[PDB]
Amino acid sequence: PFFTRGRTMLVKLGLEKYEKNFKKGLLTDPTLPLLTDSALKAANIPPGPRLMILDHIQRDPEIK
Ligand SMILES: [Cl-]
């Protein structure tokens, strides 16, 4: 599976520690535009980082 775009976002946000969480929950690159707070919660990502991720998806034009 492709996790490279998700990695790029996390590095940009200083949240690379959650690469594992994405891989574990199968939050592959095609899921990036679809990410929800519930999905990230199921991936064991704490509240703060959830906000930064969901805000990045809403703003980055390179997120399909
Ligand atoms: Cl929580």
Residue numbers in the entry: 194 to 257
Question: How did the manuscript describe this experimental structure?
Answer:
Named Tric1 and Tric2 (tRNA import component 1 and tRNA import component 2), these almost identical proteins belong to the preprotein and amino acid transporters (PRAT) family of proteins but are distinct from other PRATs in that they also contain a C-terminal SAM (sterile-alpha-motif) domain. In Arabidopsis Tric1 and Tric2 SAM domains have been shown to bind tRNAala via key lysine residues at positions 205 and 210 and are required for tRNA import into the mitochondria in vivo.
As expected, the salt bridge interaction between position 235 and Lys234 and Arg243 is absent; hydrogen bond interactions are still present between the main chain oxygen of Gly218 of monomer A and the main chain nitrogen of Gly241 of monomer B. Additionally, the mutant adopted an identical super helical structure to that observed for the Tric1 SAM domain. The Asp235Ala mutant eluted from the S75 as a series of different sized oligomers and monomeric protein. None of these displayed the same thermal stability as the WT protein, suggesting this mutation has severely crippled the ability of the protein to form a stable, discrete oligomeric species in solution. No mobility shift bands were observed for the Tric1 SAM variants Asp235Ala, Gly241Glu, or the double variant Asp235Ala:Gly241Glu suggesting the abolishment of the tRNA-binding capacity. EMSA assays, carried out using Asp235Ala and Gly241Glu mutants, reveal, in both cases, abolished RNA binding capability.
